[PDB]
Each structure stands twice: as C-alpha cells, then as structure tokens.
C-alpha cells in the first residue's frame, strides 16, 4: 500500500494540502480560465496584411523581445522568407507594444483598434496589421459527463472579445461564459458566486488568475515550481485527469 499522496502523484496530481479531499465533495461549480486550460496558451499568426518590406521591419523589432506575441510574429515571418535586419534604440514599453529604428525610419508595433489585433506604424502612419490566435486543446469535454458527474454548473472566464469566446463556447455546449474581463473582474465574479450559495472549484495557470485562484474553494493550477496558491497541481498537464478526479 502507498500513501494517498503517493497514489494521487502516480495519477498526475500534486496535492499541496491534505484538506482538499473533503472540500471537493461539496463542490457544485466548475470555472475555467480560458487561456492555458481549454487552450495550449500558444499564440499563432492567422492573417497578415501588408507587403514584404513592412513584414521585415516589424519582425526585426520583435526579435529583441521575449513576449509570446513577439515570438509568434518572428516565427511566421521567417516562414515567409524574411531576413532579420539590424535595429537601434529598441524599447519595449511593457503592457502596450514595442519600438525601434531602421534606415532612419521609426517603427512601432502594438494593439490595433477595430477588427484587427496588432498594428504596424512607420513614422506615425499605420501601414500593416496582423490577426493572432490561440489553439484549442485536442480532446474536448465529456462536459456532459461533467454535467453528469453531478449537477455541476460550468462557467468560462476570458479576457478575449465576445465572438472568440462565444465561438469556443458554442463549440463545446457551454451556455454560460463572460468575455472581456480584467483580472479584477474575475475576482468580483468569484466573490458574488460564493456570497450566494455556490461552492467553487477553479482551474487556471500562473498569470491573470493568481488572485482569483486564491479566493476559490478548491484551486487547480497547470504544471506549466513554487505554484504558491493552488490546492492541486496538475503535473500531468492533461485535463482528463481531474475530469476523472471529479467523479469519486
């Protein structure tokens, strides 16, 4: 025989406190933080509008960053045959975009307004754009089974726009989702849910959900260290494990 700790570990789960076992039997609500749980959390370019010079200019600035956006753009550009050019006065204004200088021209890359995600400026003039997406995880949910495993209420939280969340949502038979949320919004939703009856299990990663996870009745964090908050760490990185955990 092994400890119950040893048995959970063998299954793909690290139990950060032995008190979680009794706590889960009471759970009535499952909340997914979209990015990194229902998706791989890996951005990919789905469309570029502009010509090959603009593409080279934007790529050559993004190369000096480590942002996941930067890496995707640079990856796409080399696949199109772009050669990376020498940049100066680089600057990555955290939380907005990036910038640099080439052949006397000033190049900025940042968030775009209407129907695109990212925009490229040359000396103040907008001349090209990108659309960027995540990838949904292979399997899917016998989410019915989740809605069978008990009478479980299921909810999706996302920072993305209404039609990207709604698409994924309808894709998977989940009618309750909230789009466009700030980190502080998610905290407000969890507080209201607890304040009127519900016992909440929440799955997230390590980003704009640290505070939300700390507030839930039972927290689950992805393996992708000192995972601080969570009751349970899914080293498996496979959502099927806990899916199995739910039923007990």
Ligand X SMILES: C[C@H](OP(=O)(O)OP(=O)(O)OP(=O)(O)OC[C@H]1O[C@@H](n2cnc3c(N)ncnc32)[C@H](O)[C@@H]1O)c1ccccc1[N+](=O)[O-]
**Residue stretches of the annotated binding site for Mg(2+):** 72
Site for ligand X contains 110 (CB under 6 A): yes
Q: Which of 55, 109, 61 is nearest to 82 (CA)?
A: 55
Nearer to ligand X, 73 or 201 (CB): 73
Q: Which of 164, 132, 133, 134 is nearest to 49 (CA)?
A: 132
**From residue 142 to residue 181, what is the string marking binding to ligand X with x (rule CB under 6 A)?**
-----------------x----------------------
Taking the alpha carbons at both ends of the chain, their separation in whole angstroms is 20
Under rule CB under 6 A, which residues in 124-143 are in contact with ligand X? Answer: 132-134
| The binder of ligand X chosen from 8, 30, 34, 35 (CB under 6 A) | 35
- Shortest Cβ 144–ligand X spacing (Å): 27
| Region of 37-45, 75-83, 224-232, 233-241 interacting with ligand X (CB under 6 A) | 37-45
Site for ligand X contains 111 (CB under 6 A): yes
- CA-CA distance, 32 to 204, in Å (whole number)? 7
Nearer to ligand X, 13 or 70 (CB): 70
Alpha helices in the chain (DSSP H): 4-11, 20-25, 52-62, 68-79, 143-149, 162-171, 183-195, 210-215, 239-246
Number of H helices, E strands in the chain: 9, 13
Residues that bind ligand X (CB under 6 A): 35, 41-43, 62, 65, 67-70, 92, 95-98, 109-111, 118, 132-134, 159
């Amino acid at each position: 025989a092994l400890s119950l700790y040893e048995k959970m570990l063998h299954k793909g789960m690290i139990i950060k406190n032995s008190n979680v076992y009794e706590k889960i039997k009471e759970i009535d609500t499952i909340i997914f933080n979209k990015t990194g749980t229902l998706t791989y959390g890996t951005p990919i370019v789905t469309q570029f509008i502009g010509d090959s010079l603009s593409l080279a200019y934007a790529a050559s600035v993004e190369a000096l960053s480590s942002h996941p956006i930067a890496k995707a753009i640079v990856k796409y550009a080399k696949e199109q045959g772009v050669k990376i050019l020498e940049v100066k006065d680089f600057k990555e204004i955290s939380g907005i975009g990036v910038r640099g200088k080439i052949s006397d021209k000033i190049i900025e890359v940042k968030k775009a307004e209407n129907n695109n995600d990212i925009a490229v400026y040359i000396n103040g003039e907008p001349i090209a754009s990108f659309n960027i997406s995540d990838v949904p995880r292979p399997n899917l949910k016998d989410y019915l089974e989740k809605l069978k495993n008990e009478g479980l209420k299921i909810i999706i939280l996302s920072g993305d726009k209404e039609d990207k969340v709604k698409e994924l949502s309808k894709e998977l038979n989940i009618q309750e989702y909230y789009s466009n949320l700030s980190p502080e919004d998610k905290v407000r939703i969890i507080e209201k849910l607890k304040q009127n009856g519900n016992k909440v299990l929440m799955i997230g990663d390590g980003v704009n959900d640290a505070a939300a996870l700390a507030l839930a009745d039972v927290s689950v964090a992805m393996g992708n260290i000192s995972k601080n908050v969570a009751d349970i760490i899914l080293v498996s990185n496979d959502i099927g494990t806990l899916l199995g955990l739910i039923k007990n």
